[model samples]
Target: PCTAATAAVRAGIDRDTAYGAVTPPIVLSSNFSFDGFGNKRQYDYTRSGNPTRDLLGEALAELEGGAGGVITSTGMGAINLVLNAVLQPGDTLVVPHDAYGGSWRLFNALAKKGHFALITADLTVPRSLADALAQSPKLVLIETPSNPLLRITDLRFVIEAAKKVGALTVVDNTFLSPALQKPLDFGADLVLHSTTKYINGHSDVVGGAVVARDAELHQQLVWWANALGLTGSPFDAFLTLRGLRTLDARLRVHQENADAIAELLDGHAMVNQVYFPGLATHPGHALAARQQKGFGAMMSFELEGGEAAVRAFVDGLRYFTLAESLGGVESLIAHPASMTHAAMTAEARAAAGISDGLLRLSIGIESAEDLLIDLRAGLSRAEATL
Candidate 1:
């Protein structure tokens, strides 16, 4: 699959005059040349189209098995584009109960103006989704291995159910990336990702993308992206492409390091729960194994003493930096109750299953043994406070 996609991209690059350069040079120009009066060569402006951006989009589309792809400035920009393109006033959208914090914020913010109808469902259970689909939502947004929780959804079952009612299926594939799971191949109408994470792989850039199987829908998204001015910069597109070339290799190491860290936390006395899909005893283990190639680099665990122990543990770590974004070369740890989820009200966060003691980890490519030792040191400091 990657072979065909890579070949196509390579061919496109070879044909360009900019070829023979080791790296695809960033087309930093905002405007392009025109022949005489109304003659042009497909691209006129950077916002509408950039040669480097188009190349990246086409390459990503091929990789995801989609008809086309659009790149945006950030993951939320891509989400906004999907919403503006597909849903109109009074349209209803159903999303997972445990979604990315930023997504939840967008939905709630939009709901305040009554422009959109919103519903939350327990995507991990087939029956829960089946029940929600009966209400006839205009769109079903699925986030598998949900952020900070690792809740796995049955993509095929959900997509099929949505199709029966003429509802579009949009999947946020940031956690697994295209290398681990391609939602478009499993009947999803659209696949979205925060390239800032796994796809970009180094935490250096923030970008987003949407890949669509239907040409008409893809065009609508492109129009919305241009209308809203959310297209990614040429340099960002270049960085993302460079990062994607090593996605497979990076994800393999990320999964291995995360597995080792999860095992270490599961047996620790201070931990009450470890939310990792890779573990045999995890609730979503079997379902995740069926859909995803690996368990991914993200994991979360609850400490015994609640917020007190979480605060201690976060303060104790020397190597695992307390940071906000994930999917980078270096490991990171954060307390969602006080960091990422801080925007959510206490009641809302609790309803979504984000607890005060929860500690989320974005495991990196470091040696598993070193990561374990660092975790042990952090846990020890927290235990002393307990």
Candidate 2:
């Protein structure tokens, strides 16, 4: 599944395809006409299911070691739908304090609306997870190699602990994707994604997915999808599938570029800290080595001069686009203090360790030397007096 080529081989089907054609037909149909009034209808509506979406869904399920899966209109939609399906008033959910800002917004909104009580934990530590479980959380939400920070959580330890407490575990596998890490094998109840990033690879489409561990959970996800009409178009699924075909290849080069940049920044006097887990000095390196085949390309670092330095560094980059979202072939950069994590309150930001100078990078599949050139220019600008 971690090959540097087509992920289809790991998803149980490689590039070479059916009817002598290399790719699956778009199946741009919204509804399937019934042959007879009494006959079984395999697909009656697009919101429920479509041939193209189903193929992509099943392929992703296999890749993540989940029994079943569903695709949604957007990555946030996938996450929102899952929480809607599982969470009820008075129910509690444990989530990482350093989650994607969008997710933090959603959880905080839910808390305000009385949907569920929230427990924020530093999931990198096992004892913190143990403490959260004491609240009798109905669900334990985790994001590994978490966005911006690139922190690694011990999947096996958390999964085993949650199982004992009867709390379902849901992991946002977007940062590493299944190519680097499949949380289900560690016994997670659900594996989620914002396929818009790495799965689609091209940054042309916005998509999301949830892969369920078993029939019951799968049925729940689908039931909510159908109820809420959380569906993506077949054309989006087609393009996303095409992107998935080369996901494995893109990820390696992403890693290579990320590694080179991380190493370079680690030595730079202006960079106070580098967040990539690939470094031996990373806090979770040992646990990450055991659980993940890769350290992933997403990372963040704090510049010595706070916001002004971050602004200067970001403004100086040419190849790395200043943007939100990650895992695209073209490197993108953002200041979490202002962009992604702007929704988090001051106290929340402090708890999550998001300093004012923190800059997040979605390292692309670019030449290492070329990226270094870009970083050198950015760093020079960052170090200049404000």
Candidate 3:
């Protein structure tokens, strides 16, 4: 499947002929040829049909084991397209309590406007999802190894419940990519991704995608893509296609680096808690192992002191860059309280288990020893400040 995806990408690029070469040419032309009678080639305009974008969508669907896929300008755009396609104004949407901050923001914003009903559940427990399904939600959105906390949800359990109630099951598969887990194979109705993260491997592009199990649903998304004007640019699609080719190799290194760093954090004197699914002590370790091919590259840890300690530790880091996003080639560290999850109120953040001292890391393909040294220096500085 991986080799086939790479071939699809190459084929997509070759379809464009701007360069007058055998390689896929860049179709920079916004408008394509049209006969005066309104009959021409498959493409009409850049947004509606671009060989590059079509190729990307095809390759992604193939890799994800879906009927088809749609690429959008950003991850949030992809999420919105799925929700809008599956839900109506009065429908109810069930989601994980530890969802990505942006996802929660979008759903809550819609709910406040009376467009949809929103119910948050602790998906770590199977019964919580069973109870939520009893409510007959229109859609169920789950993020396995949820943001910041690394909480694992049982995919098979959720799928069975959603199927029983005829609810659409959508999973944000960003952390695992298609390499570690194929949500569709596990019976998820839809799989979403922020290709800007792991799929892109490099942090150069910001794009999102939705892969569906039904061809009719995929066609509906394609229609919405034109109506909503959320389609991704050809160039961004090309970058993502290139990124997908190297995904497996990149993730392998990322996992190794993350595992080593997680081990170091587990033994650190200044660390109060560690949150990596690969760790034996992690609450989700066994569950994650059962469903996922590998434990991912992201992990979060809490320091002994609170907010002040987190700030000092982040500022002292020399090797790990302080950034908001994850799943890149370069290592990054961030305090979710002040960065990614800043939108959540203190009480809400605490409820989600994001403490003032929490530090989230996106371990890169960097050498494990160098990452450990950097982590040690940051932790030492944090301890001194306390």
Candidate 4:
């Protein structure tokens, strides 16, 4: 059997049986020629299928240990594909109270339209999660090492609970990617990813994917993706595959940077709190240690001086960019209250424990000492502001 690292590097490269090119060629043909009057081929149209896109699907599915999967134009498109395929109007859907901002916006908007009933819960809380699952929801989505906060969930416990209630379980594996965590191994029905992030490493391409544990579920996802025209272009797929090839290596350096940074900020005078699964003080440290291959590169910390300090700190940074997205090669600093989670109302943010003082970091493959030096300088700037 091919390992994940090998699978990623060789997703469909060998399929170049015609000319033996080491890299898979981008099949940009919008339409394919037919064999005969009534005959069909494996791929007839780009929307329905394409060789480059199919290879990516195979690669991700193998990485996540799924039966098969589909690709999409964007991360939200992948979420919509699963929702449309598995949910009927008025169906009850349960999601993380601290889901990604874009996901929270999409789910709430759909709920507002009377498309489905929405329930938000802190999945890490046993009682809260049980109560939400008891409502007999049709679908339950879990985002572990959750957005901005780095909160971890016990996948086996939650997936088994949802299974007992006959609810389909989908886990957002974007933060850790398949390299760090494979949700399918813990009985999740589907694994979702914002390939635009780590899987695409360079931040140049935008795309998403859904890997299904069952063939029938995979087909359903495929059907909806094709019907809604959610599949990404051949070029995007090709680029994503190129980025994916180095996910394992990139993530190692990312985690190394995060580990050092988290240690530095854990009790710094300019930092009020540090939220990273790698830190022993973090509430989810043990669970994350047990559940994932490594502590991922994403983290969030509360600054001592609130929003003004936040502004000063980010402005002082040298390598980390002020941006919205995560899981790229370059470091980024984001304010969840004004950036990623802004779509949710202030009331929701308060209830979910996302404060204006919070600053999330997406560590890149840069030298750990350099990032630490940059963060120390930023903290010095924050001290001046205070």
Candidate 5:
């Protein structure tokens, strides 16, 4: 069955198929030359529009099943573009309690400056999403299989509920990428992603995208993107295009590696809880199975001895590098309390259920046997130190 992989490769070639080049050439210039015909040029400048970015946007749209797509400097910048496009200064925005720390920070920061109210809910339970929507929030933002936690959100339930309140639903589809799940197909108004992660695959570029169901919202997001001058370069777009070409294959391998590791972590004495939807023991496993093609490679677990154990385990790992950002070919391990989620106060993080001992793992497409051995060594060190 042809899927996103086919779409990616075809879209890549189609973007410049007219030139008969196997790889589409990126337009590295800041501006485009216009003909003297009728003053209706499709492109003019980089900030306003660029051919390279347009090709990436079109590919993103086709992959996401959206009318159009807008590329941005970063995922946060893309989210900010949506916030500006759809949310007024005094308007309320509904968010998840355990959303990505970067997302929470952005919401909290904007609320203070714009006088907008930010409402939080436990999206794992559909009722809480409905509860938060009761305030008539202008925008409903959620992260399914949320970062660090890997909890699944009922996307259809969320979208239907948001529509009742006349709120636009936005899904941060970065964790699974457009490869595993397309929120727009489930009734979401928009889908957002961090291309720097899985979309780029190599972990070399930092980029993001927002896809809209129709051209109206697409225009709004693009207008805001250009107005704020938050645009990604052609090189980054090319990197993402190159990455997308093999996304499906890479994701399959990632899933294979992650599934094995989740199994290893689940019954281990060094683990308190394994947060992976791939495991039947996981709280949201059923929902994930029903909603997604496969449980994603991202998962988290708490070391039995808490923070000290985590530090030892993380430092002892050889195969999995301790780093921030995920969705790449290399395995990455990060402690949310000390790394990605450190921006939030300890109390806030605790309230959100991100314990200091929680270690998030972005499983790579590595040989599963090697990864298991690496982890065994790390866990042995953690247990021995305890």
Candidate 6:
């Protein structure tokens, strides 16, 4: 090795020897060449590892205070990987009744196939949580500030409770990225994300991440990820890394916009009740304040006139797009009954308090004034429909 003047100078010289680029490059190679027979590099195959993907994994792992992270092709892939890696046949898993629609569908489908015993519980409620924990599940899946409804859960409480039964706790941190909340700090064994949402930010790529608190669990996750070929591509990882860089800045603006909108809707004639932890009236407000760095950008409100008004309201919006996904740079509006929570049965939806009139919003980094104006117009139009 050629020595340089100083450590900084040496690093600079070595960096210059390569491309000298600050950001990681997308290495699109499917496989790396072996040094010789019976010898292989750390990244011998893209399926097992990619430089671009590793960058994101490492970054996310660091952010979430995890030992390692497995970046998957899709958010659902990450969820399935965790379910498969942790639980065996006949093992029990406790999941949120109000989990994301795709997650709900997959968990139920897997249980139906006799993959494992699945128990749905509202982790926010004390009795429901204690009853579920009494079952001694292999894994307890928590999704606080749950989908559509924005119901919050006590992560530390659940994690400690799960520990009593020797159950691993996995939190779906998609709604609030590691920037706002790090589940590992609260004793969560694993943290999951739909990188398609906040982690990617731009709505350009679809990806997911599963960060494990323990090294052994992380190693298992990595092995399963490679075995299942659930790893994300170099290009998607590159794009997601770019998005992750702006997470802090983006989340601040996102929360600001969301706060403004929540204030606008709360107690308004066109809205029945607002589901946001930032609001003092919300049951989970104090718990969320103690748990999360911020309330985050997602909120839902019960529209005054149900689905018919929703049709008119969504049609009248200018900036906020009517879409299924949340946590993007651009605002989105989703109808839980027909969009995000549609996979759940009507009875289940009713039991979870996901009404036909509930509309979820993913507040973006857009100007609060513009978003407010758009919402006002939409609400006015919806009111007219009624």
Q: Which is the leading candidate under TM-score?
A: 4
- Model 1 Cα lDDT, one tens digit per residue, 78-124: 99999989998778999898888789889989888887899888877
The segments of candidate 5 whose C-alpha lies over 4 angstroms from its true place after superposition are 37-40
TM-score of candidate 5 to 2 decimals:
0.95
lDDT (Cα atoms) of all candidates against the true structure: 0.86, 0.86, 0.86, 0.90, 0.87, 0.86
lDDT of 3 by residue, 112-218 (tens): 99888998898778778878889999999989988888888889988887999999899999988887888998899899999899888789999999999899999
User: Any idea what lDDT model 3 has?
Assistant: 0.86
Over 194-299, each residue of candidate 2 has an lDDT whose tens digit, in order, gives 9999999999999999999898989989989999989899999988888887888888799889889988999989988999899899889988888998888988
Lowest lDDT 10-mer window, candidate 2?
7-16
What overall lDDT, based on C-alpha atoms, would model 1 receive against the true structure?
A: 0.86
Alpha-carbon runs more than 4 Å astray in model 1: 1-15
Highest lDDT among the candidates is held by which one?
4
Writing each residue's lDDT as its tens digit, candidate 4 over 1-386 gives 97888888777666897799889889999999888898888889999989889999999999999999799999999999989998988689999877887887789899889899998888888899889988999999999878778889999999999999999999999999999999999999999999999999999999999999999999989988989999999999999999999998898799888878888998798888898988888897898999999999988999988888888888868899999888999999999898877777999889889999999999999888889889999999888996
Q: What TM-score against the true fold does each predicted structure earn? A: 0.94, 0.93, 0.94, 0.97, 0.95, 0.93
- For model 3, where is the 10-residue window of minimal lDDT? 4-13
Which residue pairs clash within candidate 1?
none
For model 2, the stretches where C-alpha displacement exceeds 4 angstroms are 1-20, 345-348
lDDT of 4: 0.90
Tell me how far the alpha carbon of residue 246 in candidate 2 is from the true structure, in angstroms, after superposition. 0.6
Global CA lDDT computed for model 5: 0.87
Clashes of each: 0, 0, 3, 0, 0, 0
What C-alpha lDDT, on a 0 to 100 scale, does residue 322 get in candidate 2?
Answer: 89
Q: Please state the error at residue 42 of candidate 2 in Å.
A: 1.6
